[PDB]
Amino acid sequence: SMLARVVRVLETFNVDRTAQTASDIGRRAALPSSTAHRVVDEMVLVGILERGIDGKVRLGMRLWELALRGSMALRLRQVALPHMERVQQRVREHTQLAVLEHNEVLFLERLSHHEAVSNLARVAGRLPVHASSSGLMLLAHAGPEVREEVLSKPLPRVGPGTVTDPEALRRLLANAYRAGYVAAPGYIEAVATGIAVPIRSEGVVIAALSAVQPLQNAVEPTVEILREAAVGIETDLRAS
């Protein structure tokens, strides 16, 4: 399909790849040279891609506009940001907002203080569900079918502290469901603890609000600050 070829072209761009030649796009998308050059030209023609004065193609401003305007991602981030900014003022590490997408964590927003701890979460970037405080919080509220899919895959260690045993994960998830937060000491990187709380709309967890902070930092203060922020978000969501 033309739409399938267009999506494969979009998929060649990534969090640290802004500009490509049609030949490189063809190679990354496993598309024949002629097909890659034709599809790229059509995408440039409608403004989904733009061609710079360097002759390389980039994701187009028209694509950005059509994808964000009125979107669930933009509306939630908009409601969330003032509350995320207050957490950032208080904790001065990282505040981020995430959803589940195809059994991975996708980040809608990330606020970072200068010389905060190392953080691998990227806006419009992904991390594993089982290893991420955000992922474990959201997976705790997913159906048994979603939990089974995720729990039945080989589960790599991401950081030193990553829990990979399916039944140990079920115990974590039950505790997180009960407690209304996940602390994840060194589950992504040795130096970092992720802490995540749920964001609810009409009694459904739609997102996770998280902090990333040095491993040795107190957990309880951050948990409380995120809960307060999450309450603010749910209030503001209910009337938006």
Add this chain to the structure above:
Amino acid sequence: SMLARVVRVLETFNVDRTAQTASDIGRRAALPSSTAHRVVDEMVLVGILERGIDGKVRLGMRLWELALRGSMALRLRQVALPHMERVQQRVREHTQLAVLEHNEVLFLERLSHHEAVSNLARVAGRLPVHASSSGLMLLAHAGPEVREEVLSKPLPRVGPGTVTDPEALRRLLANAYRAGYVAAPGYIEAVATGIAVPIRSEGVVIAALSAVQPLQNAVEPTVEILREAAVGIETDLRAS
């Protein structure tokens, strides 16, 4: 063509329209029912759209991700946002970031205090180039061909203060170029003044940084704050 039909479907969504029926999409996109369902179903299949439990379709999280990942609009917003938050802390009204796109203003970012003045600028939304502080500041640096296009087209008044006389506009643009700022009292709404300054990169104005504040607030102090923020953004643009 299928790519053309897909773009027309994306175009039926907007800043104020999040969820539609395939029937409503078919009406707005000029597609007969069968074609509207087929294109929407295929876009739902590749995750470009999502179909809710209410049976309504929405812009997809996968589309948001593929459009924003490593995008020019994300990179510039990322560099700008900390400086924009400092301005927002000081002025406590609205701070926003805009570019020119097809001779209209397109907003990349907007920060708002909950008790701020009425503001009609939306992220991934547009305002007229002649009527917004952001548009006038960007059009002052657009070069002669774009300038004459805008000065020769229909120029309606938007708010009470909108300057519509083409020669009075020519003067404003020449003054804006020299002064390095635009104050636009009631050009969009009676209650509000837009104030915009340029963001340069490689000696080219690529964006406008703007505040929207009550008509009665003093302009000079907001100009100074935006100039400082703009220098900060430019330094971090040179360093990246």
